[PDB]
Amino acid sequence: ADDALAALGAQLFVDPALSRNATQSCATCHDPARAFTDPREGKAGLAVSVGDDGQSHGDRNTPTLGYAALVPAFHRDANGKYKGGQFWDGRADDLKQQAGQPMLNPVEMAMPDRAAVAARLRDDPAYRTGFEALFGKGVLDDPERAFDAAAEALAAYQATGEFSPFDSKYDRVMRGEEKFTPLEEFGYTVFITWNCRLCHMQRKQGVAERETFTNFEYHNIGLPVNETAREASGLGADHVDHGLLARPGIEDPAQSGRFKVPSLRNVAVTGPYMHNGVFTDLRTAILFYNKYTSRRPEAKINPETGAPWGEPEVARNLSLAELQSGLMLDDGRVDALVAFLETLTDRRYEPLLEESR
Amino acid sequence: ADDALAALGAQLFVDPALSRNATQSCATCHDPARAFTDPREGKAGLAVSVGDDGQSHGDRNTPTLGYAALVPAFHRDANGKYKGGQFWDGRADDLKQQAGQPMLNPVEMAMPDRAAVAARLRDDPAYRTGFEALFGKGVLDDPERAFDAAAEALAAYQATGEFSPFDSKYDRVMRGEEKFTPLEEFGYTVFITWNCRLCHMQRKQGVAERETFTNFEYHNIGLPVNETAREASGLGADHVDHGLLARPGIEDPAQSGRFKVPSLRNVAVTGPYMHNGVFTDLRTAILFYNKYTSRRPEAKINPETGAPWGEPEVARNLSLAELQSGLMLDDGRVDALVAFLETLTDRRYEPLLE
Amino acid sequence: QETQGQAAARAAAADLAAGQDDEPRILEAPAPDARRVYVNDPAHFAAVTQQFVIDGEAGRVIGMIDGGFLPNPVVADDGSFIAHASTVFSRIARGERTDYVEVFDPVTLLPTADIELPDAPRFLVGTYPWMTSLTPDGKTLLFYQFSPAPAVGVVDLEGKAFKRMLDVPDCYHIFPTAPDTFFMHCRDGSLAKVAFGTEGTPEITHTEVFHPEDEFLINHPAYSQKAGRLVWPTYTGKIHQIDLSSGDAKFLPAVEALTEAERADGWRPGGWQQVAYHRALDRIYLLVDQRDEWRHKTASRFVVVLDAKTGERLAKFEMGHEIDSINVSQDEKPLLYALSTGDKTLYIHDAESGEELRSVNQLGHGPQVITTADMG
Amino acid sequence: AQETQGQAAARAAAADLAAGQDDEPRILEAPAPDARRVYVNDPAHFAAVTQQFVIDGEAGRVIGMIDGGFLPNPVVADDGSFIAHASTVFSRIARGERTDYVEVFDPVTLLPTADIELPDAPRFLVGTYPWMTSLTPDGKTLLFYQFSPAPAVGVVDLEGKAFKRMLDVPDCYHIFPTAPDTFFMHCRDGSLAKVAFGTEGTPEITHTEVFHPEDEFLINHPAYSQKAGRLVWPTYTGKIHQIDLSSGDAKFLPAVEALTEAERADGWRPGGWQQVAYHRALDRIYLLVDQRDEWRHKTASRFVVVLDAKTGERLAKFEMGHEIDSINVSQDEKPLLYALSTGDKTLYIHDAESGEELRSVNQLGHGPQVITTADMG
Amino acid sequence: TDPRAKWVPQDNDIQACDYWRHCSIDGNICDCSGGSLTNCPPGTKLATASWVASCYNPTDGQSYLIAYRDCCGYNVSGRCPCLNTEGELPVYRPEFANDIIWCFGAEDDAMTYHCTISPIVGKAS
Amino acid sequence: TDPRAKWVPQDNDIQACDYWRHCSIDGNICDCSGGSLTNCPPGTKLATASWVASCYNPTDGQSYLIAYRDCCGYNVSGRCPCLNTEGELPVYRPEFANDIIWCFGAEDDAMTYHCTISPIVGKAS
Ligand code: HEC
Ligand code: HEC
Ligand code: HEC
Ligand code: HEC
Ligand SMILES: [Ca+2]
Ligand SMILES: [Ca+2]
Ligand code: NA
Ligand code: NA
């Protein structure tokens, strides 16, 4: 059952029959060979993904599903900080609430409704047998049950060790089964002494048992609009991605422009970066942080364009207290961090490291 | 000898035959019964004195001769402060060089010249004998010698115990013979802890053997012109009294407006005060020092006039480091100071206080 | 038995073991209460100084406030704010001088007002708590100016502005009785009542002379604003108690802290804040020891406690330490605080018995003045 | 044996009283700076205000003091003409608006003759390292290290009394000036960087070769003799790097061991604050050493080894007889060895030859750490 | 108490200079002036920078990474001063150097040193 | 060394708190911070105001008025601190009170206290 439900999810996950035109499965955009992200080229490069219709582009980068099962369900903590949830703006509560969405999203898999999804599941005798053994007879006859069952099978599948194996070098090193290179060890020291750790470590203090390099909080780090992705998405020149403020139920204008801190696990192989896939290279994502600390003019220029980073999409609610650390990362420290962030790659994606390198 | 000399001096000092009209002697202006100052009402009150001639008035107030003999001879000390000498502007070096000047001053005793002074000395058989025994035969037939020897007798006379008796109550208290009244003691304590002792004590530290409540220095304390005295002097309203700078050979502009710190001995009985007699009461003179320290509206007003003190006659070289002590003398402290100053009255003038 | 550092070690070990997460942050001091005690370190005339905020109950430092040269601390009886008149210089101890008043939130210790005092008008003197004083209404702060002449400055803590200087006669110390009036002690041995309008020469009334010229009243009388009791020792332990509630000075019978005998064997008050006054208990505490006439600022190893009404010795404590300054919490069952400048330590005593309960050491360089709120 | 200075004063005051000798109370001038003047700075364990003591080391007498702000860097012009410090104050003691500034002082009247604001609060606030603020050899420029947002060096013109410019440097530390417009720094990678700077323009930065492994640790208080261009840099183990900068480029001198291997085998290590002094005229190194665990390297030491800087030969091992944090020597012949104890707040003044304690100056603040002497001869 | 002896951590009193987390602290322990083991006192401003050390916890046999942080904007507390240097490296390895005033990132530009906190941020490898 | 005992003046060492002229000194002896018995250290500013005391000179049995003057405009010296109170009256008798910072009349309006000199201004009474 705990195995069988994940097993059913495994099948759904790769089944393109869950898309309108049958071209697209979860695996299409969350490609297992690419740490569950989208290797496909669209009108905005790798920044945003193309739906089942073969034309529609999303407005956000497709995030890894690796370690997404470690994120807590979305909640407000006692200090008034929102934490957890799924999607960049935390608008899904958890994996199960997220799962049905790509399915019905006309920009993604674009099934017209629950009833069309159920009908798909029905046509396959393996589903009828797999679903019925877990959820009961006639489950596939009830669109609401079938759709929820599918979401739960998918959520259970993403919670398996296949998605969060913890077998990165970093893990191996924390187990004492090996050591960091000197560069890696310095990256690690920087990471934990500089401001990164104020957002990219599970805990404020103490040691986490299954660290995924995010505190699950929401921060506006002052990223500019990704012009090409925003063109591809068709959302308009006047459109503002309000991040967490777009979550239904969030009204507080202080949440405008804040996004979930992503896990750094497999960061090395899941470029391009940030919620709109604005930066292609890992080192560029790191350099971006120097714009709050460095006085050198170069710190204000995106190295990938040679132009200013650009005005923040949302100029208010910047995490200035954390971002303006009073210390700039020199290049030695940025190299050290890249090396440290690469130790975060799962074993099976270690071969992908060569091409990024 | 020094006795006989002083006794000749004593003869000359009360002799009006040393003035043009023989109407006036040293003692006329420096009246022994008024601590050697001038009791005579002139056109400007007692601010200034009238010469032999009847209408010539001075521009300075007649100082006491008591304790004048303790003042050192004029000199610049190693810190560059001029000290000592005689007259309010230090223009005489010592008593000897001073004595002659009134004899010859046309606004004072007004003898035309030394020889007219000599002739008057001959007229008196007592002087032929007195002078000749001290300075030798023919002293009076020579104007130069006669005049210098007269100045010497006067200087010797002013150096006697009679001019500087050290028998004030202040002196008696410092000898353990008597105590100060609580108020006198308060005033003494105030005098020596406030800025007064920065100028009106002989030494900077240690104990003086014969204190005369002056360091013999020159200071411009910023005094205004004396209105009537200046008019009476006939020196004109264009005139500036530059104090020490008027001493020949003092050329340094910093000394303009500076006057010798008077001895405060007998100060209670030698009003009016300051180089120009501008303040009639001792209290007023004490209060003048508050114009530098006090913020209060009364600071600014001469209480004898009810009006602003007046601009300094000489607006520069004010002794500000000293006068601006930061502290104001209250009523009680000004009381205490008057009480303390009265203890500087010599015994024989103790009856002059009321 | 467990010290505060030890309990802290254990709670920390347990949060680690349990994997408990907590956010590193800025603590708030515990709300001001009766047992809070403030120790001002005038630091032997150092140009900067510290005030320690101390939980008298735990004997724990719960915060600190920096001050300038010989700052005058004030503590609102109601616990709603602390303030001080302080003095800084643009180059440590030299250059342009700024006198100012700062008002602090008593839990975050953040400054809530910073009020420049024109023309550098503070009296710079070893710290006499009553040289700067809050009005009962807490709306005004009055500070003494010695130079060029005795004067009193009026600070509006409500509009956060300096108002003006009051011209007074030859008098010292400031004991506010009301939002427009305060008493001072004069050189002629009276107290002067100063009532200040919004404008004009304040109206000034003298009491009768209440002590001889050769009788010497200490620099640190205890004054309880809420009781209006001005408690004032002389060098010999003769204590003038003055009732100031009613708006005028009723002179209370004079009392003696030491026995006519004891003063024959050389018992005298001595130290800094030589006297404490507990309002509700109506008690005087006095630092005493055997000393020469002219060692009146030295530490004392003994405290005597006497009824403010009768003058009967209620206790004599051997403090066990050289104590310069005493004060007391004004709650019931007060602590008697006994500050040693030399040990730099606040010894916190039970005021009833005199048992040493706890102490907080390392209180600056030469702590001198103990302040407490009167909250009840 | 012998008459203390307070006894000699009592005697002479008594004689002046007896003889009615007058004298004007005034402000003394300090005696002219000389080879035996020693400055002791008291960072006061991070206090917001601090003191420097001007000391006559011959008499063991405090002849002056200079106030400073938060963790000031003192400098003393080698020729005696002035002293200066870079300092930090705040408008409300330790909070509000920060003003970094440099003050120059007349070394006799001790009066400030310059007060130079440093814009944008650029000082490195660190436990006092003498070589984090440095005079050029001609005394006309003061260079101060900045760490935040990145390593940089501020240039201050003491002659025109103005701040000039920040220089961007690599990831490097300390400032050993060698010329009116050049200094060296030590880099994280184990090399030294030479920084040549003009009024404007990108500084000329050159790196020497790496001169120590990543696992050999160079202490924060190397001795640097500007006049000899000798940089004497101990490691944690008492191995001493010597770099000769006197040709205006770095020549690496042979390493000497301050401790023998028996001693190292038995846990002798350098330790303290200013662990090392260098007497220029004798070409001798003084190192505070003691038996200590390897991570107790900032604790006081009780011994000074004196070694010949050319051969590495040990010449003495002095038992200091006190807990010493910092040493330094006068630069004249027959030098004094100054032995400052932060714990005792006392400068012990020793004969550098025999190691014998000669006299001491106590009551030097709260946590005095830094001794500076001028090299005048 | 032999200052030169190998430092021996204890896990039983955080106000003492041998407490295990203080193995590379330099300054004053914030618990002594109104903060706690890992919080700043009222009125001071918590820095975001830190230097780190790996400190052996004799309670659990584990070494932990302790990222020290200063409480800034007040004159030095003067209470519970301590200086330990376990693993402490010279200023050129600033990550591990503890003479630096690590007040960077403190609110209001606070850079004066009041005291230091000793939070754990990870296990040591 | 017994602080409450009679003060015993000596005429043999001015840097000692029992030197005869320091009989009503409060603070620090200027001689220990580079002044002398009657002169200020360099850099400080000599006040013109003073508190006085009659101090007994053991050596001649005479009693001298010492008018203490403050050297101002530096932080307190920290050296040879002393507080004696022979003849010392409370603040409302300021002429004899020594808690006051007698820096009035100091150049440049210097009012911070550094140390105190002990010059004789007269014989007592
Ligand atoms: C491309 C058309 C996609 C297909 C098909 C699927 N996903 Fe996806 N995923 C996509 C994007 C563009 C985003 C981000 C959108 C946003 O608004 O933030 C996502 C996000 C998720 C997440 C959240 C992960 C996180 O927040 O870190 C999960 C758990 C997820 N996707 C799972 C998922 C499943 C189960 C799918 C098939 C049913 C599926 N995705 C399809 C892009 C696309
Ligand atoms: C909170 C103020 C943060 C601090 C400090 C740092 N990071 Fe961050 N990081 C943060 C967020 C909120 C995000 C997503 C921003 C968005 O809107 O998209 C990020 C992202 C990264 C990434 C990209 C990861 C990915 O796209 O999957 C990297 C590589 C990253 N951050 C690294 C990083 C480092 C190295 C930091 C110290 C220099 C650091 N971050 C600080 C939130 C915050
Ligand atoms: C009134 C006309 C006077 C007669 C006659 C004499 N003196 Fe005089 N004396 C008088 C004045 C107005 C002044 C000060 C004038 C000035 O220029 O400052 C003086 C001054 C002296 C002094 C100096 C005293 C001091 O500075 O304190 C001496 C010693 C003195 N006078 C003596 C003196 C003698 C010996 C006389 C007879 C020859 C004599 N004076 C006449 C007023 C008058
Ligand atoms: C130097 C700055 C002085 C200080 C301080 C004080 N006094 Fe003075 N006094 C001074 C001078 C130079 C003079 C003569 C000024 C002039 O131009 O005439 C005086 C005068 C007096 C007098 C008048 C004496 C007389 O007329 O014979 C009195 C009574 C007096 N001074 C008193 C006094 C007191 C009480 C002071 C402290 C408050 C004080 N002086 C300060 C020089 C200086
Ligand atoms: Ca990505
Ligand atoms: Ca007169
Ligand atoms: Na793009
Ligand atoms: Na919303």
TrEMBL record, chain D:
Any Pfam family matching the protein: Me-amine-dh_H
Keywords: Disulfide bond, Electron transport, Oxidoreductase, Periplasm, Plasmid, Signal, Transport
Swiss-Prot/TrEMBL catalytic activity: 2 oxidized [amicyanin] + methylamine + H2O = 2 reduced [amicyanin] + formaldehyde + NH4(+) + 2 H(+)
Location in or out of the cell: Periplasm
Disulfide bonds: C172-C187
EC numbers: 1.4.9.1
Family the entry assigns: Belongs to the aromatic amine dehydrogenase heavy chain family.
Subunit structure: Tetramer of two light and two heavy chains.
Designated name of the protein: Methylamine dehydrogenase heavy chain
Protein's organism: Paracoccus denitrificans (strain Pd 1222)
